[model samples]
Target: SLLNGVCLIVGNMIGSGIFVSPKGVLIYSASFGLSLVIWAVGGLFSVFGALCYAELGTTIKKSGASYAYILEAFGGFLAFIRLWTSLLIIEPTSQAIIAITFANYMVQPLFPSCFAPYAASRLLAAACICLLTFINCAYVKWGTLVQDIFTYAKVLALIAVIVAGIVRLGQGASTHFENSFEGSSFAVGDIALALYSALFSYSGWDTLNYVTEEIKNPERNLPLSIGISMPIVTIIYILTNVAYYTVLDMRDILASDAVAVTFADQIFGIFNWIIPLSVALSCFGGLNASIVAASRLFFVGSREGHLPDAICMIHVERFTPVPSLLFNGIMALIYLCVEDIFQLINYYSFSYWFFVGLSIVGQLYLRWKEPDRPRPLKLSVFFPIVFCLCTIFLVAVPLYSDTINSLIGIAIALSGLPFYFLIIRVPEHKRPLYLRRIVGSATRYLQVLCMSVAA
Candidate 1:
């Protein structure tokens, strides 16, 4: 159980972000030491955030995690609305986009040209998505097995990278640590900006919440999983960056499109197959983890009657949410085909943070409204306050920086609200009799504009 939870946490957290975020951070903050510090600080934030989530998970003991918590704390409409938006756009699209990035990195050697890169990326993305969809739909156990295998591979690959770098350094590779912040002010403003990038990378710390139902002892495992996994991830992230800096020049690290590949080349030279293999392993693990977690959101929405009944179908033998899995797989493939990887990353990151902020707010509201609520593992009062402040700061800094893509993501996520009401409103027969009367009255007025347009 612990191992399963660890795999879930590490596998989820180490996905495409760790592979890509270093360059983004380097672009904003040039110093290697500062970069490491940013990662460490981000880890601290994640740990605190995870502690809060652990408390919530134990108290709630629900599978939908944030979706369930938000609904219980707020109300049904807002929860369903959030779920609908996530299902139609946010979750699947993000996973698909990340899978495409994985494909691009994996296939770069075979297709070296600029145009070839885009073509290979899309083709591989589509292939992987469809293949995984088929695997998941055909047999739920197969999908879980794939997740287990690749997740382990990812952990081992990270360990190997760290071990290899250390060995090579011992054998006379120069360990150069450059202070890019020579005579510069380390203002709170600068740290805040860096924290934005760092926090995004740390965002997956709460992935266990998505599949709260599957864990053996959710109350015990949830907190333990997050507590153990998050700190471990932080250490690995810091070490990985340190390894990169030690083995490869900072400029090269910044300039390279594939940082892991660069690290591999630096340590093992051209004959080294380990770098490409590691990339493949890491990406495959990420792809598997993304599919596993994102499909749960769709399942939760369907189960709660916020989506078509067909979405709630489960495989009899494996107990997997097959329809939801296929739904996500198909959407991810579509996203992979249509959008560039960076665009997908930016948009998905934006959607994730937006919902996360709302969820955090829900927790605070719950505390105030139900002081006697059964909270087995409650957070300190200061925790929620600090979490909200940090999230708001991170969200504001990016928007202020004119991160247009991120804002576009917010627009995209919000756009789902209208569609939610249109397609996902509960059936009249299924709703309570009194609630149906209220809905009928509301719909009568709501339809006036449509009726006028028809006339």
Candidate 2:
């Protein structure tokens, strides 16, 4: 039953990034081999991360996996800010980018001559946001089922790309394998940028950990799910890029607006639509996976009295967090504009890996602070140290790649600090005298705005 854990990782992992990020990553790295290497190691880094998180998962058998771990180790103030960044910016922006990708890909086959990012495409993308939000908000199981279906198709599509590329290679095709680094010249900062793009592709490496409680066998299934999915996803990604290089020249790869679509068109000819269709579905599944993971954080945060109670509301009969699901959707819809997909990836990655690094830091803190706490599945002591180092690498280096965009992510994350003090870390116990006496009745506006919106 928890093998859907496999579905969760693969579903969330392989998305617009693979189909969309090749050009950006290769462009940024300026070395084919380096780009390939970054992707390969990114996968290893992810599995290494899963090992460390498994310690947290088993030690605390609760929902809100990362947030819960952070709350315990870092204190509620830090945990609350992480949750705010996720709800307002990270989760929604991620889904919106994918939805935008989905709509753009779908619109291409319909209007082959259109050279613009047609307004129709954006509207369709908005509608996709609505549909994804609706399905997830309605029932939890249905959303997961959709994720599984699209995830399976996305995997099969990648296999098809690999096989077709291999076949072409077998038939006297010019394998660009040797030429992978032909003109690639690495600069100092862009290597970080290149790895940032790859991280975008590898985003779902820890997705299963978020839904640890939903699994039938959390102890065994949670860790194993991550262990199993990481290598497989990584291999597929590397080979798929190799396949792309086999068919397209480096310049074409760089220039093409849609890398996967062009690769498919050259290889499959009339059947190129399958690639776009696969991309749309891949984005669909990725969006679904994000929703599933995002709502859980809100649900648990609210239940613990950090977020407003509305987010804790679950449909009585269905046992789904409809309110939280809807909340994520609304946030996603708000962010679905003016962002190029890769730029969006870069922004989200900067903030994402920041918290990722912090969560693992919390792991190290707890290891020292709560020494005797039972860890059902123990990782080697070395793993967390190494894990924290790599996470710090991911968090720190990526910023240098594109300081402007990456800093925006840091800014957005920091923006939550004010909200955290007002909502989560407020002096509820003593009621700040200023609120009741100096600014009498002012709490209603903040309460109605934040709480109602969360609902």
Prediction-by-prediction clash tally: 0, 0
Candidate 2: Cα lDDT at 416: 76
- lDDT of each residue in 53-72, candidate 1, tens digit only: 76677666555677787888
The whole-model C-alpha lDDT of candidate 1 against the native structure comes to 0.66
lDDT of 2 by residue, 1-455 (tens): 76766765564455557777777787676678887888897888877876776567667554566777788786667888888787777877788787777877776664443455657767888898897777765656776677768867777787888898888888775554676554444445777777778877776656465544355665566667767777888888888888887787777766666666767667665756477787788778777776676666766777667775545555655566666666677778877775477777777777788888888877887788878877666667897898888778766775555678767766777887876666554565456645444333443454343343333
Candidate with best TM-score: 2
Model 1 is weakest, by summed lDDT over 10 consecutive residues, at 446-455
Clashing pairs in 1: none
lDDT of 1 at 8: 58
Q: List clashing residue pairs in candidate 2.
A: none
Q: Estimate each model's TM-score.
A: 0.80, 0.84
